[PDB]
Paper text:
By using the actin cytoskeleton as tracks, myosin also powers cellular cargo transport processes and can serve as a molecular anchor and force sensor. The myosin motor domain consists of four subdomains: the actin-binding upper and lower 50 kDa (U50 and L50) domains, which are separated by the central actin-binding cleft, the N-terminal domain, and the converter domain, containing the long α-helical extension known as the lever arm. The active site of myosin is located at the interface of the U50 domain and the N-terminal domain and is allosterically coupled to both the actin-binding interface and the lever arm. This coupling ultimately enables the amplification of small rearrangements at the active site to large, force-producing conformational changes of the lever arm.
The structure of the actomyosin-V complex in the absence of any nucleotide in myosin represents the rigor state. In addition to an unoccupied and open active site, the actin-binding cleft is closed, facilitating strong binding to F-actin, and the lever arm adopts a post-powerstroke orientation. While the actomyosin interface of the rigor state of myosin-V is basically indistinguishable from the one in the strong-ADP state, the lever arm orientations of the two states differ by ~9°, in agreement with a previously reported rotation of 9.5°. The overall architecture of our rigor state structure not only is in good agreement with the medium-resolution cryo-EM structure published earlier, but also strongly resembles the rigor-like crystal structures solved for this myosin isoform. As the strong-ADP and rigor state represent sequential states within the myosin motor cycle, a comparison of the respective high-resolution structures allows the detailed description of the structural transition of myosin-V upon Mg2+-ADP release. In addition to the ~9° lever arm rotation described above, the two sequential states differ primarily in their conformation of the central transducer β-sheet and the N-terminal domain, which twist and rotate, respectively. By promoting a piston movement of the HF helix, twisting of the transducer increases the distance between the P-loop and switch I, thereby opening the active site. The subsequent rigor state is stabilized by a new network of hydrogen bonds formed between lysine K169 (HF helix, previously coordinated to the β-phosphate of ADP), and aspartate D437 and isoleucine I438 (switch II). In this way, small changes in the active site (~1–2 Å) are amplified into significant rotations of the N-terminal and converter domain, eventually leading to a lever arm swing of ~9° upon Mg2+-ADP release. A comparison of the three states of the actomyosin-V complex (strong-ADP, rigor, and PRT state) reveals a striking similarity of the actomyosin interface.
Residue numbers in the entry:
A (entry chain B): 4 to 79, 86 to 97, 100 to 150
B (entry chain C): 4 to 375
C (entry chain H): 1 to 7
D (entry chain A): 5 to 33, 36 to 54, 59 to 187, 190 to 595, 629 to 792
């Protein structure tokens, strides 16, 4: 990362600083990474964080300088398509099935997050063009 | 399954039947008759020679030969007719179908078993055979495993001690007093009252007087005095033609030679001293069990009072702390056959048979190898 | 028998 | 291996035979970290593996062979879930139907359901007793060959309820009007009163095999049943172990001693008689014998046994009891006599109408006869007691056979029977703390029946394989003939028992010695219990069983002295006693040899036929509705052979899937390149990649056959792929959504 990148990342980090001390929580490190264009799993986030315990995850605070090596480590389409084609074969996917799998398998998300991202993308039959939704969510 | 035959040649009687039966199908005298006169009528259907119940029926015309005497087979061409009659006419069964069990007195000549075997495999073509010591079978019949057995038929007498199914061969006594020598003595003594019997066809009469009238005295010299002084003892018998004979103090003298073979000029001791001497040859831990289980067996022991006379005269020899019991079951004339009937039915036995496949390899000497 | 007796 | 993190595994537990666990960290070639339901880690150790668990889709399926891991805890789980939570009391294993007795009445037997099953094919439905009955009823029509339903279990399990509904089905689908159902059901109280016993472990155990032949005409209208009985346990009549009873009818009779018509039987209380006091357990708690009597007499009268014959029957059973009290005095070690004016014999002769002096003579002597001559010979006190008890067993076995003939007279119909369907009700495999000749016979019968079942299943598998064109050499046949030959064949344990009964001074000790000499090292299945010389072990089909030699020989023995029969046949007081003995080696045969022959008659009856099998299991010892004790149920499932059946099935290709339904399930693993137009070739390609060892599956014409385990493997790799896909998608949507929240914070 060059000085400009480091400055942009630090600025973004400071926007997520909700206490004014220039720091985030372990549990926010992943959030910052996602805010910076990374898409790490919660497992990946905990791994780069050093698998913190609940107490330090919720209250131990780290500044940008400690975050940066972690961002580096995190930084270092056809599969995404096949992954969506898993749940198809007419190029559509049920909203109910996607909701169930996203809220019940893997690193389960909330139904509200899924409703928010899914709002407006399914048609009257309840089918999602997943290639278009995928291009949309990858931009 | 095919049940085996049990055929107790004995002497004088043949006893035969199927294993698991409780009495023999066939009991007939082991006697071969040939006609001696000239046959005069023509077209009569004359027949060369008669076996068994025929020769008894027609005996006035015949000469009667016993082929077995003193448990030794002395004429094989006679004997084979008797077996032939046993299988084919009397049991009405082909012996080639199923096994046969045969019985023999102990200590008799070795070649007798070899001939029995050779005839059973060669002519009758029996699938398997065995020969068994008679006195062993009398224990199977009386339901015991420890015994001393006085087995005495026509022809032969023997004692065999058996303790828990171990026989004690050094102590086996054999004696040749038998029903035939009581009969020949009874002929030579009836002559004192003038009656006379010189032919085989009337030797067969004396043999039946002996059976009905004779009995054994509990003490000899007082009944000898009694019936010499009072005629109250004498009894009478009808000969076949209707002549009446009368027999007095004589009718206990012939069965009493079993206890004094000196009367017919044998050296040896009677059945009581041979029984006791047979016990004495056994070792001292077992004598008390032999003294309790004395088992009478075979027909010559049927005389009334022979049990009580034995118990008396062995108690006269045994040490008085011992206890002496004579077991004389009423069947005892058949106990050798009954014993062979249970023996041949035991599932454990089926291995024991001399099979034809063995005999064809080893020859007739196999008997001494695989039998007792 | 063969010696000592008649059979 | 694939014991990975979040593999579930079963672990053995004392209190409920197995517990679920979850494998908390991957296995690698000594001890496993296992998360339990009770606590997050408790640790398990591996000995000089735990049984893996089936995937959640398979559990609860209608047919236990659909499972991919076939073993005790998965079977126990499927029966437990289906029974407890879904209240389905019927389940299939292979051919077998397993019926879990609910102890509760249920709506499932209604006539609408009867219609719902009629005309279906077998697999088309969830299993129900009607689906067995229907399979039989169609096969009888489709083919000439006659049919049997075999019902096995403990008597508590409710075999009578299964037979009841199987007949109700036959009546309704025949459209028949007649009245056989009512009569066959109304026969049960007499057959249970005579033929049924209280054992150490069960009350109303059934001690015979009962075969009801439902006859059909040439048009398959019903014609009314013929009843046969086999394998009756005659020895129970005269001997009982601790806290057993003999057949209920004796205790029902003794309880009724106050009733006016039973005055002349001069009964006592049930411990007054030698044939009932021996168990020391006269009363079953919860039963009034005094009242079961009345239901027996009602059942008689509904079958139209006249009141005169009913008093004849109870006169004979009072006979048997009074006979048993007759007590011989030894005169001598080899002779005996009954003492003068002995009272039990007086009352027995008064009951049976015989001259006291003839019975007193013939009990103590026996007659030999050759054709020319006959001898009356005395017998020992031991033989006198064996003779008396053989006579009592013979009077009883004949009375039983007579009552069953009057049942048949009330059940027969004149119409010519075209064909029949038999319902055979029989006891299961049996094992107790102390184990004895009664059990030895029962376990031999169950060996014969399990052989027939293995013949049949193997045959139907060769048919199914030739339908699907798969080589026969792949199905192995498991054979228990080496165990039957240990028992029934020559020099077997029965043959050496009969041979010991008649060898002189035979005894249970010297019998045992013959066993050891003959078998101990020579046979794979016979073993000696280390610490005893008076017992032996047979490795039966279902389990090892230790039998104790003490007192087989006294149980083994029958000889009826024919002259004692010939005295009783002369009786002139009442009709029945001469009737019993209407038409020898038959008297000479021992109990074991009679049983061996009765079992041959049974097997030659069933072999004429096409079997269909049912198994009944008892879920709890306390009759609680719809509760399922794993500790009891495992034992019942072993005893019914269900588990050794499944062990045999798991050796084959248990799991059978149609190509199109397979393709539907597993296209998720299949690249959209690689699916062809040809389904069969597509799946042949994919599966030949997914499971590299071809020995795990066969390509039938219509179905893939998998060995046990591989369908679970495919389900695991499917779940792992589907999870990895879900993680990739969902992390991308999360990083998108928070990236947009970052754009919100920049705004
Ligand atoms: N009831 C009897 N009383 C006395 N002697 C008998 C009696 N029956 C047979 N005998 C004699 O004993 C011999 C028959 O004995 P048995 O045991 O039948 O011979 P084996 O067993 O050798 O054939 C014959 O001599 C016969 O005379
Ligand atoms: Mg003799």
């Amino acid at each position: 990362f060059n000085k400009d990148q480091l400055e942009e990342f630090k600025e973004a980090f400071e926007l997520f600083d909700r206490v004014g001390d220039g720091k985030i929580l372990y549990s926010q490190c992943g959030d910052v990474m996602r805010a910076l264009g990374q898409n790490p799993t919660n497992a990946e986030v905990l791994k780069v964080l050093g698998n913190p315990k609940s107490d330090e995850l919720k209250s131990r605070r780290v500044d940008f300088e400690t975050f940066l090596p972690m961002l580096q480590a995190v930084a270092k389409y056809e599969d995404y398509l096949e992954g969506f084609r898993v749940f198809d074969g007419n190029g559509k996917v049920m909203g109910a099935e996607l909701r169930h799998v996203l809220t019940t398998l893997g690193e389960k998300m909330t139904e509200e997050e899924v409703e928010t991202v899914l709002a407006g993308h399914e048609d009257s039959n309840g089918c999602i063009n997943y290639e278009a939704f995928l291009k949309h969510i990858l931009s | 399954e095919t049940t085996a035959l049990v055929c107790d040649n004995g002497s004088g009687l043949v006893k035969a039947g199927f294993a698991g039966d409780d009495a023999p199908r066939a009991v007939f005298p082991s006697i071969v008759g040939r006609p001696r006169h000239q046959g005069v009528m023509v077209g009569m259907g004359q027949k060369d020679s008669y076996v068994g119940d025929e020769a008894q029926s027609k005996r006035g015309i015949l000469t009667l030969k016993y082929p077995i005497e003193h448990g030794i087979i002395t004429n094989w061409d006679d004997m084979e007719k008797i077996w032939h009659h046993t299988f084919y006419n009397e049991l009405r069964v082909a012996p080639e179908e199923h096994p046969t069990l045969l019985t023999e007195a102990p200590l008799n000549p070795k070649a007798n078993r070899e001939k029995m075997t050779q005839i059973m495999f060669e002519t009758f073509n029996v699938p398997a055979m065995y020969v068994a010591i008679q006195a062993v079978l009398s224990l199977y019949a009386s339901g015991r495993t420890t015994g001393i057995v006085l087995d005495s038929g026509d022809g032969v007498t023997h004692n065999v001690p058996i303790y828990e199914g171990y026989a004690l061969p050094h102590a086996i006594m054999r004696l040749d007093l038998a029903g035939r020598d009581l009969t020949d003595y009874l002929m030579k003594i009836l002559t004192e009252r003038g009656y006379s019997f010189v032919t085989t066809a009337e030797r067969e009469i004396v043999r039946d007087i002996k059976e009905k009238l004779c009995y054994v005295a509990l003490d000899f010299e007082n009944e000898m005095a009694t019936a010499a002084s009072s005629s109250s003892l004498e009894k009478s018998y009808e000969l076949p033609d209707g002549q009446v004979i009368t027999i007095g103090n004589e009718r206990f003298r012939c069965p009493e030679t079993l206890f004094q073979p000196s009367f017919i000029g044998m050296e040896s001791a009677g059945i009581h001293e041979t029984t006791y001497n047979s016990i004495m040859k056994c070792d001292i831990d077992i004598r008390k069990d032999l003294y309790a289980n004395n088992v009478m067996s075979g027909g010559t022991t049927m005389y009334p009072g022979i049990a009580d006379r034995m118990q008396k005269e062995i108690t006269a020899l045994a040490p008085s702390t011992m206890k002496i019991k004579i077991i004389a079951p009423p069947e005892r004339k058949y106990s050798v056959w009954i014993g062979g009937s249970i023996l041949a039915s035991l599932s454990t036995f089926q291995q024991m048979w001399i099979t034809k496949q063995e005999y064809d390899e080893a020859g007739p000497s196999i008997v001494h190898r695989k039998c007792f | 028998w063969x010696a000592x007796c008649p059979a | 291996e694939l014991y990975t993190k979040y593999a579930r595994v079963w672990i053995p537990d004392p209190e409920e035979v197995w517990k679920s666990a979850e494998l908390l960290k991957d296995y690698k070639p000594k001890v496993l970290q296992l998360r339990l339901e009770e606590g997050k880690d408790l640790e398990y150790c591996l000995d000089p593996l735990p049984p893996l668990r089936n995937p959640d889709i398979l559990v609860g399926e209608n047919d236990l062979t659909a499972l991919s891991y076939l073993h005790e805890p998965a079977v126990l789980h499927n029966l437990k879930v289906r029974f407890i939570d879904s209240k389905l009391i019927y389940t299939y294993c292979g051919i077998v139907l397993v019926a879990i007795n609910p102890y509760e009445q249920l709506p499932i037997y209604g006539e609408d359901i009867i219609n719902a099953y009629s005309g279906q094919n077998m697999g088309d439905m969830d299993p129900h007793i009607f689906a067995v009955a229907e399979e039989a009823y169609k096969q009888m029509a489709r083919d000439e060959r006659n049919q049997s339903i075999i019902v096995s279990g403990e008597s508590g399990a409710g075999k009578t309820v299964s037979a009841k509904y199987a007949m109700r089905y036959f009546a309704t689908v025949s459209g028949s009007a007649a009245n056989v159902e009512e009569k066959v059901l109304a026969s049960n109280p007499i057959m249970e009163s005579i033929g049924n016993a209280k054992t150490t472990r069960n009350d109303n155990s059934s001690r015979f095999g009962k075969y009801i032949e439902i006859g059909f005409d040439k048009r398959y209208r019903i014609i009314g049943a013929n009843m046969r009985t086999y394998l009756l346990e005659k020895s129970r009549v005269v001997f009982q172990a601790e806290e057993e009873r003999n057949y209920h009818i004796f205790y029902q009779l003794c309880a009724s001693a106050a009733l006016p018509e039973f005055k002349t039987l001069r009964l006592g209380n049930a411990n007054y008689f030698h044939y009932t006091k021996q168990g020391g357990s006269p009363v079953i708690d919860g039963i009034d014998d005094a009242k079961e009597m009345v239901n027996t007499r009602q059942a008689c009268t509904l079958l139209g046994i006249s009141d005169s014959y009913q008093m004849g029957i109870f006169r004979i059973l009072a006979g048997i009891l009074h006979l048993g009290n007759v007590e011989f005095a030894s005169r001598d070690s080899d002779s005996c006599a009954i003492p003068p004016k002995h009272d039990p014999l007086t009352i027995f002769c008064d009951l049976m109408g015989v001259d006291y002096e003839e019975m007193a003579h013939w009990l103590c002597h026996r007659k030999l006869a050759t054709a020319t001559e006959t001898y009356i010979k005395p017998i020992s006190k031991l033989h006198a007691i064996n003779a008396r008890d053989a006579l009592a067993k013979h009077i009883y076995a004949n009375l039983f056979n007579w009552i069953v003939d009057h049942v048949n007279k009330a059940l027969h119909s004149t119409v010519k029977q075209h064909s029949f369907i038999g319902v055979l009700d029989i006891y299961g495999f049996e094992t107790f703390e102390i184990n004895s000749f009664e059990q030895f016979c029962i376990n031999y019968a169950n060996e014969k029946l399990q052989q027939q079942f293995n013949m049949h299943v193997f045959k139907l598998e060769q048919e199914e394989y030739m339908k699907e064109q798969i080589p026969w050499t792949l199905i192995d046949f498991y054979d228990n003939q080496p165990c039957i030959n240990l028992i029934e064949a020559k020099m077997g344990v029965l043959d050496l028992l009969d041979e010991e009964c008649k060898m002189p001074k035979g005894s249970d000790d010297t019998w045992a010695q013959k066993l050891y000499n003959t078998h101990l090292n020579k046979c794979a299945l016979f073993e000696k219990p280390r610490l005893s010389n008076k017992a032996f072990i047979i490795k039966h089909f279902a389990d090892k069983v230790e039998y104790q030699c003490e007192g087989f020989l006294e149980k083994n023995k029958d000889t009826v002295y024919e002259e004692q029969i010939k005295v009783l046949k002369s009786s002139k007081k009442f009709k029945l006693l001469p009737e019993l003995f209407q038409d020898s080696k038959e008297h000479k045969k021992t109990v074991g040899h009679q049983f061996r022959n009765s079992l041959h008659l049974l097997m030659e009856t069933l072999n004429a036929t096409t079997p269909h099998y049912v198994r009944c299991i008892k879920p709890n010892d306390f009759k609680f509705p719809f509760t399922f004790d794993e500790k009891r149920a495992v034992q019942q499932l072993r005893a019914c052979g269900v588990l050794e059946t499944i062990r045999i099935s798991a050796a084959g290709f248990p799991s059978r899937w149609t190509y199109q339904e397979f393709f539907s399930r597993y296209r998720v693993l299949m690249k959209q390149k690689d699916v062809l137009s040809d389904r069969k070739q597509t799946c042949k390609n994919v599966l030949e990649k997914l499971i590299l060892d071809k020995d795990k599956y066969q390509f039938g014409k219509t179905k893939i056959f998998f060995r046990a385990g591989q369908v679970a493997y495919l389900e695991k790799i499917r779940a792992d792929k589907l999870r990895a896909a879900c993680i990739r998608i969902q992390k991308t949507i999360r990083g998108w959504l928070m990236r947009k929240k970052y754009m919100r914070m920049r705004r």
